[PDB]
Amino acid sequence: PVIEANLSLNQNQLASNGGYISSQLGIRNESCETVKFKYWLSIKGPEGIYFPAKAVVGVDTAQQESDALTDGRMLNVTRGFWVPEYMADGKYTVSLQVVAENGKVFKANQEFVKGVDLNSLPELNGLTIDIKNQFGINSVESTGGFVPFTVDLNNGREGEANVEFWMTAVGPDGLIIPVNAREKWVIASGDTYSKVRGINFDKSYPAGEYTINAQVVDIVSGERVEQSMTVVKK
Amino acid sequence: VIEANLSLNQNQLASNGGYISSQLGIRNESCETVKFKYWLSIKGPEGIYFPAKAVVGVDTAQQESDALTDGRMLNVTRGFWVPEYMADGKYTVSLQVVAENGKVFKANQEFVKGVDLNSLPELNGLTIDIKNQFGINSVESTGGFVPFTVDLNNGREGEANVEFWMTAVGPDGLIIPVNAREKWVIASGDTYSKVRGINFDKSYPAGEYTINAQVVDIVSGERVEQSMTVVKK
């Protein structure tokens, strides 16, 4: 019982004043028997924003209904959503999510930005943050694995920058795993805090999805900025 | 297998932040000797997640394993700073133990910063009251229904314009709609009051679901959150 899910956005790039985004959802039953499943469209944004794409004028009373697909058949839906002005500027993730009757989870994600450039590194006002999965390693075995991350904090400002920086891995069973302890830094003008920092996914760590999350706070302004990568333990 | 506790010397920090000293207890209740890894992590508002542990230099350490004799208990004092620049609001401290066999054990305490302990989140007179109606903290693998009471009380002298929604953030990257995005004009002294439940379908994966409600003031742009945790066995 395998489902194939895709998602595409008619646009990636919203200005600060927000806007409308029209999406195209594709759900294909690649299996031989007929398949029942639930699906929905959800948005995840900065500052712990999580919201459903779906909006209603009245009182939301609906429960999550099941759907179905004929053998080899595909569902095709257009779905649009507003992203209002009052929502935080930053990087957003739209997620088509399918839960099949058998427990298997399938997803398709697209990103968009609001009030910043699609290509751009997160920044604290000249101080740019560059965190990357160094070797494109997107999973580790049940028996364990090591994934290294490159960390580059570049002070583009004309003055010194005072920052606190840390990393966690948010994962199953409510786990928040320290990846990098809280570090305080004075970074001089034009200078760079640059290093490699890895996480060892111990054999004993539970199977599932780990969200590798890095944060940087400007100690003076109080602006906080994030970057995230996903690693799955099989 | 493992018994974990956590207590805080302080629950209540002012806006200018402060220091919190914690006491970690880890007890091996098992008959054989047990190996495990453990750590201390903080979760706050606005998607804040940070490790309790801080270093002045370059963090270079790896997550070391520990061990406990049969019936033996580990006892550690561990403190952490919560600086002024961190967001005001409700925080969760979490002692987390991962045993060599895969079993996860936790002990959580809450604290607040710049607001009263157990106070209702508010958007400036507009108070938000979301509660697990019947104290149901888990559902069986075969499924279950958990209802939530929702009370949005406009204490202001003028009308309040809000947008409101709910999700359940859970395993395998799932963000499950619990309440669609609703726009509301709430008159002075009035209440948006209702019950809203989530059906944890048999098919939903085992694990930890974070029931999350958010309210935005459309005029000010202030956003406020309330969260409750439900585990599917």
Author numbering:
A (entry chain H): 38 to 271
B (entry chain G): 39 to 271
Lines quoted from the article behind this entry:
RbmA is a 26.4 KDa protein, with putative carbohydrate binding activity, which is found within the biofilm matrix, mediating cell-cell and cell-biofilm contacts. Even though RbmA is not essential for biofilm biogenesis, it confers a high degree of mechanical stability to V. cholerae sessile communities by a mechanism which is not well understood. We found RbmA to be a two-domain protein, functionally arranged as a dimer, with a high specificity for sialic acid, rhamnose, fucose, galactose and N-acetyl galactosamine. Each monomer is composed of two structurally similar (1.4 Å RMSD), but distinct (24% sequence identity) domains (A- and B-domains).
